[PDB]
């Protein structure tokens, strides 16, 4: 996250770290035995780390489970990045409580102007890596189609929308990916992709979950 804050521990009771002898995406707790990140995120050898602040100290709170499975979306691309979400089983059910907390699915989408919460350990720096040790936060709009699609022309779909600055300086970036983007206590997007990192005029890149609602249901009820 470049621009954003020092979230604070456990302020954020559904990020989750997704390991594998580092941390290499984030993810949404949706229950106690589902997570979603981004389908470009997928690798196996995944350890889902819940309750999470300072990634690399154990400091109480935290609760290492590994991935029994991972489903990504059967129709996503790999060169648009469209349909890029995934869903991951957990081993075992998370114990749940104020500090690991699921976050709700979304029943409508949310318009342009909706303020959002995006945040991961993802880079802080838009040239050049700086990875924090603690979570970071960032309150970002969701911007209007006409916007979006004049930034990254061709390659919008309406799997997607895009949330951030104009101007630069404030935007997710590498290590963010798979993370939440949750507006009004709803989970309405997953940080995927935006070109180079708080670039003006290249706002961040998210997948529109309200899109895959029934999917999401369907599939955990099926598995
Ligand atoms: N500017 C952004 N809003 C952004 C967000 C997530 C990203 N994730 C990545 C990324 C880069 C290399 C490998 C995997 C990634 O998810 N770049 C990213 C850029
Ligand atoms: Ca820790």
């Given at each position: 996250?470049?621009?954003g804050?020092?979230?604070?521990?456990?302020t954020?009771?559904?990020?989750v770290?997704l390991?594998?002898?580092?941390?290499?995406?984030?993810?949404?707790?949706?229950?106690?035995?589902?997570?979603?990140?981004?389908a470009?995120?997928?690798?196996?050898?995944?350890?889902?780390?819940?309750?999470?602040?300072?990634?690399?100290?154990?400091?109480?709170?935290?609760q290492?489970?590994?991935?029994?499975?991972?489903?990504?979306?059967?129709?996503?691309?790999?060169?648009?990045?469209?349909?890029?979400?995934?869903?991951?089983?957990?081993?075992?059910a998370?114990?749940?409580?104020?500090?690991?907390?699921?976050?709700?699915?979304?029943?409508?989408?949310?318009?342009?102007?909706?303020?959002?919460?995006?945040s991961?350990?993802?880079?802080?720096?838009?040239?050049?890596?700086?990875?924090?040790?603690?979570?970071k936060?960032?309150?970002?709009?969701?911007?209007?189609?006409?916007?979006?699609?004049?930034?990254?022309?061709?390659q919008?779909?309406?799997?997607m929308?895009?949330?951030?600055?104009?101007?630069?300086?404030?935007?997710?970036?590498?290590?963010?990916?798979?993370?939440?983007?949750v507006c009004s206590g709803?989970?309405?997007?997953?940080?995927?992709?935006?070109?180079?990192?708080?670039?003006?005029?290249?706002?961040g890149?998210?997948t529109?979950?309200?899109?895959?609602?029934?999917?999401?249901?369907?599939?955990?009820?099926?598995?």
């Amino acid at each position: 996250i470049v621009g954003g804050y020092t979230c604070g521990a456990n302020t954020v009771p559904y990020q989750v770290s997704l390991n594998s002898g580092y941390h290499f995406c984030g993810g949404s707790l949706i229950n106690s035995q589902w997570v979603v990140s981004a389908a470009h995120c997928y690798k196996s050898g995944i350890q889902v780390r819940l309750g999470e602040d300072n990634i690399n100290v154990v400091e109480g709170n935290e609760q290492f489970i590994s991935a029994s499975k991972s489903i990504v979306h059967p129709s996503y691309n790999s060169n648009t990045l469209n349909n890029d979400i995934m869903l991951i089983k957990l081993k075992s059910a998370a114990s749940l409580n104020s500090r690991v907390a699921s976050i709700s699915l979304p029943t409508s989408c949310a318009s342009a102007g909706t303020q959002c919460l995006i945040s991961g350990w993802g880079n802080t720096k838009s040239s050049g890596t700086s990875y924090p040790d603690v979570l970071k936060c960032l309150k970002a709009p969701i911007l209007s189609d006409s916007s979006c699609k004049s930034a990254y022309p061709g390659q919008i779909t309406s799997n997607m929308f895009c949330a951030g600055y104009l101007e630069g300086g404030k935007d997710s970036c590498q290590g963010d990916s798979g993370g939440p983007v949750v507006c009004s206590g709803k989970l309405q997007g997953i940080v995927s992709w935006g070109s180079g990192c708080a670039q003006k005029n290249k706002p961040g890149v998210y997948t529109k979950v309200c899109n895959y609602v029934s999917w999401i249901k369907q599939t955990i009820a099926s598995n």
